């Protein structure tokens, strides 16, 4: 369960 969205996003 790795989602690139979870670890990369603009705060």
């Amino acid at each position: 369960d790795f989602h690139f969205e979870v670890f990369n996003f603009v705060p």
Partner: antibody, heavy 123, light 107 residues
């Protein structure tokens, strides 16, 4: 001007434990944190990564079931609890923020690295 | 996870010349590939993120390109700074670095 500082490294015997901390500046914060290590004269190896809310945690297969990554937003401290230590985990351990995305072609990246703390495992 | 192999292992060039470094993945990493530069005694530093985008302050002479499995980092005419170790990195399935490509001055 945000910075990361690691601590907890040092000399430890094989099969023993050490515990590293990585403190980011100030306050939760909205970025994932990762552990990256480098053995002497070798390349970089991703150790572990934890999402901003500790909802997602991963590890390289080399350390799986031996190390445990956690974090606390309130203190903005990242932890690497190291168990069942081996000589092959002797390395310089970096704490790093590695965020990068181009969603909606909105370019955003944040890449911050600590100077690292040293881990030496030997009898 | 995904394995990244870098070629050349060592690249020997003169300043003013121009470098092409390859990084191939065993399985497709989409466009989530970054390039890092590292010199002795220093933490690594981001050059390119998401295949082709330069971090702030990165000279235009660096450019990234590729898709899925094949990627390349190009240095159009090398400066003395640029001779160091370069790592490709994927963040499609967790994070993985390549074994590194060392860029040496040819004499």
């Amino acid at each position: 001007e945000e910075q990361l500082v690691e601590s907890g490294g040092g000399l430890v015997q094989p099969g023993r434990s050490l515990r590293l901390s990585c403190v980011g500046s100030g306050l939760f914060e909205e970025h994932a944190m990762h552990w990256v290590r480098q053995a002497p004269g070798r390349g970089l190896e991703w150790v572990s990564g934890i999402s901003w809310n500790s909802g997602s945690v991963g590890y390289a297969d080399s350390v799986k079931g031996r190390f445990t990554t956690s974090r606390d937003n309130a203190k903005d401290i990242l932890f690497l609890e190291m168990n069942t230590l081996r000589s092959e985990d002797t390395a310089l351990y970096f704490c790093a923020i590695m965020v990068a995305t181009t969603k909606n072609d909105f370019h955003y990246y944040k890449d911050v690295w600590g100077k690292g703390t040293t881990v030496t495992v030997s009898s | 996870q995904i394995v990244l192999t870098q070629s050349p292992a060592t690249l020997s060039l003169s300043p003013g010349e121009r470098a092409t470094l390859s990084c191939r993945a065993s399985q497709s990493v989409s466009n989530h590939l970054a390039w890092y530069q590292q010199k002795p005694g220093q933490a690594p530093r981001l050059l390119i993120y998401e295949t082709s985008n330069r971090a702030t302050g990165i000279p235009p002479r660096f450019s990234g390109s590729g898709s899925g499995t094949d990627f390349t980092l190009t240095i159009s005419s090398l400066e003395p700074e640029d001779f160091a170790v370069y790592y490709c990195q994927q963040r499609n399935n967790w994070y993985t670095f390549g074994q590194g490509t060392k860029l040496e001055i040819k004499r």
